[PDB]
Amino acid sequence: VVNMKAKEIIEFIETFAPKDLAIEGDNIGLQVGDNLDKEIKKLGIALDPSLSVIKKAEKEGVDFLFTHHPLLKDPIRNFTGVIYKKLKILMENDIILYSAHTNLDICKNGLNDALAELYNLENPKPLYDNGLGRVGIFKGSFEEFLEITKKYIHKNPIVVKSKEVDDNFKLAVLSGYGLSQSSIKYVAEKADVYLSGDLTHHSKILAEELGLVVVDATHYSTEVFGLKKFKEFLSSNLDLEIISLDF
Amino acid sequence: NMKAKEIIEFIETFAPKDLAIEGDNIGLQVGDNLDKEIKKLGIALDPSLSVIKKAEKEGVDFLFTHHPLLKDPIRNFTGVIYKKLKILMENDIILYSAHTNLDICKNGLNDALAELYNLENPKPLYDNGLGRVGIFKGSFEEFLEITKKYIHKNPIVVKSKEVDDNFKLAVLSGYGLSQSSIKYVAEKADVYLSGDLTHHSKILAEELGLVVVDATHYSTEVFGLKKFKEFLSSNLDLEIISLDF
Amino acid sequence: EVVNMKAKEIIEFIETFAPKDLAIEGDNIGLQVGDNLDKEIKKLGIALDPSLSVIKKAEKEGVDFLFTHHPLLKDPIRNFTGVIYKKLKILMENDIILYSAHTNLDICKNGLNDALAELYNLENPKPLYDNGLGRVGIFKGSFEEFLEITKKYIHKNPIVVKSKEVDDNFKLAVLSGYGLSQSSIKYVAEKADVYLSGDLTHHSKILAEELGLVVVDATHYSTEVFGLKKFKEFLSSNLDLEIISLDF
Amino acid sequence: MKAKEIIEFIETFAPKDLAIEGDNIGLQVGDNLDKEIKKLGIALDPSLSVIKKAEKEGVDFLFTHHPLLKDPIRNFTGVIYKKLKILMENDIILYSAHTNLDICKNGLNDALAELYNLENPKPLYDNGLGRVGIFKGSFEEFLEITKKYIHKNPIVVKSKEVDDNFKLAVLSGYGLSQSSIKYVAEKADVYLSGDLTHHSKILAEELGLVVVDATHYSTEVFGLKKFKEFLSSNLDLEIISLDF
Amino acid sequence: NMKAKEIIEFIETFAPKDLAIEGDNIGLQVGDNLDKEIKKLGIALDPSLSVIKKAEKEGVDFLFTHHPLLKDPIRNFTGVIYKKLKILMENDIILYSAHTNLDICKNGLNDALAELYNLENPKPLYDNGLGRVGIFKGSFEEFLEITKKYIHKNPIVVKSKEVDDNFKLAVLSGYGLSQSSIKYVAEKADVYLSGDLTHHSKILAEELGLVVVDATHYSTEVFGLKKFKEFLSSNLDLEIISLDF
Amino acid sequence: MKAKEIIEFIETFAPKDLAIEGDNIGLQVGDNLDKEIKKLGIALDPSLSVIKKAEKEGVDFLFTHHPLLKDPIRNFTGVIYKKLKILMENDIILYSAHTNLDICKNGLNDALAELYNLENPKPLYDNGLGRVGIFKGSFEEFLEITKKYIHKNPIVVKSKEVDDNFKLAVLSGYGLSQSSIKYVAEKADVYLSGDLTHHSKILAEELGLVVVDATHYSTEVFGLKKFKEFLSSNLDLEIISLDF
Ligand SMILES: [Fe+2]
Ligand SMILES: [Fe+2]
Ligand SMILES: [Fe+2]
Ligand SMILES: [Fe+2]
Ligand SMILES: [Fe+2]
Ligand SMILES: [Fe+2]
Ligand SMILES: [Fe+2]
């Protein structure tokens, strides 16, 4: 166990998930920070750079805060309320905030590959062109798929049973939010079952009409699974204390 | 009997089309002759394929839905939209929608929720006219039981903070739980009741200390829709059924 | 010798002649109205326009596959009333498939523009635009031998904007349908002496006069129907299938 | 009289605020508006031949209905070079009243409305274009008036039979776009305008709207002649027409 | 013994935020609690790094700047903006801005210039209400003498034409010498007083025969800012200093 | 020589494809390019007085660095009227090589780079504007070269102390925008350009970038004079300068 500098953590992460992989206009990289020669005693991993995560980072003496989601998607020019409180804590404690978003989704053994491997997808391919998600054939019954889901991801997934599903069906997976109306239409042409998160009403109705079976294992869980794999990957390779904050 | 235009004038008297949010696809969805004579009106939340199939089966002549058939325009007619239009057209079933104009109007879907909780001194939540906000004269757990009894028995409760009696309560029928809505409503109420909660919105409400209650998109509208159906039945000499509720 | 075909077989044959990739950007080609393409087809109807009367005539003649050059809609819609209601009703209750080959039929080999280029026997023909619309080449003859061919085979009374005297062996551009927009006039003025197309309007006439471009309006309809008949003769020769024309 | 005084007279008759948004009305080409004007020319189009003819007739003030340019430019070659050259070396002022002349009272559309003696006339569009009203007569008395005063051989799209005392809409110039056909079909039995094209013809047939194309040129020149005679009556000034 | 609400309310009384040009980033720039108690107010033209550093050294808790901290929004916090927010946040210094609303308001930055030259019948130069234009009751050389004495000792003068006495003078505090501004003002005045002249604007002014006087962006605003500072000091029981002037 | 031959020579030296964006380069005003040329005039700006001077000196081919118009127009009044009238009545060709003259080799930026003899010079931006390199010397010999050859009273924003053998970036014309300051601050210690404004000054101070404003005019005229000497050396043609 040893102290690392900020650059060295960043180059290691960017080796695993190159910034080249992020879809256009994704706010990846350094979120908050100035000096990358800052010395790091404690790396914190989180899904969200939420207020309570940042408070907890300060309480636990985190020096480098890694989050999957960027601090801001839409840019701002006034600093009040919640964003004031978050930046104040990060700045007063001089805590570095860094994010790997879609580049962590897409890269090999990333969040989507983690799901694809979990379901042991036969000859998996990118679901989208950019290329988010994985699609392939699940060599098993629908109910062995659900049991794997319940065991490793979320024990109470929402199932939109739009049609009967035969063994050896085509399965698409997308970590996080993949259940938009436009996504449903697209995936309906490519798979029998769609595993993702953040189901809403209109998407549910749409999936039923198209006969696409949708499984909502929550936005949180479908990502945290991969994040745990990512956290174990860092711990094995870096001589550095690493904790998780919101999982 | 009664003609289709006569059904439309009644609805548009209650919920004028001008009340609708800009570019909301309200009004006649599918139909040609409005002097068509109507013996059986059907009410639905969604103009879904199964709703439309069920309408044909039940001999519905006028299909009223809260949601429009299409939000985004199209120029090809294949797959699901082909089947839906084929059924409606071959049977000459009129499809008509009152969307946000039904949300906003007096005694509409939001007012229905506002009355249920008996909100003291109610006001529109947004300026365009969506949602209601007011004081709930009671404890948080009397609010929750009313929710469980009349709306949805298993609402997701994001308990961002302790809630004292006589708190500010905002209600929005349908989809009111976007990130933009959370930020806006956090400044106007202590508790926000709506539908279609997603992760980022949940996190955001927690940061802002807004208590959010997701009683589902479906249920928070169907409540008002049932009231609307009873209103139509009281005033129109016409067989009226509900299709997806 | 006369036989029923499935819709997909007809579509694949047409797309062999006029591949869908040949169509210019955002052109609404392909399946307009229909669902099941294993539908069996006894009667193919060809039309220029998917007009209300064309569709009525298709239903009256028991057409099962309706091919039109123009798409049903250029601009998308989200309400279905009036005329579009009547057209979709007829097509759907009768399960008539509506399918379109638009600019891909204009551009392809032996397509609508090639038909014109071939008619006028254009020496060393080239595409008029880069996307692939129109043909331009040398007309090996006088201007009035050009006019007589036009009057005999395309339209008996074409509008001629005589912007200048035209010498023999002139450059002739052809564009089936609507090629007489102001931007088109300016562009073609740099590439040809005479421009044969359809749908002339006032400002375009004035503009052609200023540039000295001779414009011949043989109508939108006729400059396309000529090629469409060739296309219909092509289908009739290759498919054992009853094929009629509806608006020509 | 000076150019500004002529301009002020025209803008009294057709105020510039009446023009639909982004219509390129007003001074097209010119510098000194205190210049004194000895010969005014009226034209439909500021075409090359119109401008050449203006210089030949010694016109110093050229009024056109259509603006010189709709689309702005930043290079000066070819035809636009020649037109600006002729106007500038001879100090000929080019001025346009476009849709404001269409919309204004006794303007181009009103001229048509008065010609057909439309009973209880109203503007066809909300912005101010076109007139619609009832024609107190048969369809063929409408045609006879058209053939006598506007165009001897108008294209008639007879989409349906027309009863006496029908609703007649008029729009001088180009009113036969697809969007216009759809809109006017809800307001009239017969539509008189110009510049018919194929798809618009088909659309009118489907909707049962009877369309009469008396050409873009003729439906405007009629009003322009009225406008020219109006100027001649009020201004002590030599006034000629150039393309009509 | 004054809190932030009261200072902000006072400023917005003088220069209402509604007077600001559309999408002008006025108001609270950096801050959270406005019940914070304020004993030392700092006034600055620019919220620059050195201004903010100087604010910390002088123990300023409320920092007022004419220019907003950011015009273009950002979503990353590194480099210079990191340093600035860090200083403001750990010291809990409130940053608040009155920009174009201070330019336009009565007795604001533009009116300050108009009074200085004693413009007869002054009127707003633009429709949004930036700048003042009126007649200068004097010669051009009395105008320059007032300029050199009170604004800037050596202003750039683009003498595009001779200027007669009792000429029309337009003034705009800050940056008013854009090419479009030159075209517009050329039609309304003989002489244009502003700041931040660039080449193309100089050339354009010469062609149009508009005499332009560049008394710098800095000086034409600081003049009004000094009036504003003295106004605050007269009305507020509070230590008030200037930072970059 | 014919006009096309001159254009062809210039475009050999500064190819039009080198220009950034839809930069309004090339033929500004003119029609016949088989015109034979009696006097070529070179100017920085196609200003009214430059054009007046061109007509006075009997220039028939007017070359300017800046285009006549950046934004397109559809009305021809006031100043643009006066400029076009003079050019058209005298049949004077107006032609511009703008950013293609900035970017090309031995162009305006290379001229500055050579003046300061930048060791190992490179393009400042990716499109190819400006040059950056090492100035083998102290800051005050950089200033002494600036005051003697470019402008006697340059504005110096001394954001920090400058060591010998520092990185110097040059951009002829307007390179002192806020976005440019931010970009260059990461690539150089000293930035030599023109058209400094307040916000850019403040920004340079925060970033520690030393900015030297030797005016928009002078930083380009330096290169333009070299370009004029090049044309004079290669073309048998009377060549004068108009605004420098
Ligand atoms: Fe996510
Ligand atoms: Fe993700
Ligand atoms: Fe809804
Ligand atoms: Fe709703
Ligand atoms: Fe066509
Ligand atoms: Fe075509
Ligand atoms: Fe017209």
Ligand SMILES: [Fe+2]
């Ligand atoms: Fe007109």
Ligand SMILES: [Fe+2]
């Ligand atoms: Fe300013």
Ligand SMILES: [Fe+2]
């Ligand atoms: Fe200002």
Ligand SMILES: [Fe+2]
């Ligand atoms: Fe330059």
Ligand SMILES: [Fe+2]
């Ligand atoms: Fe320049």
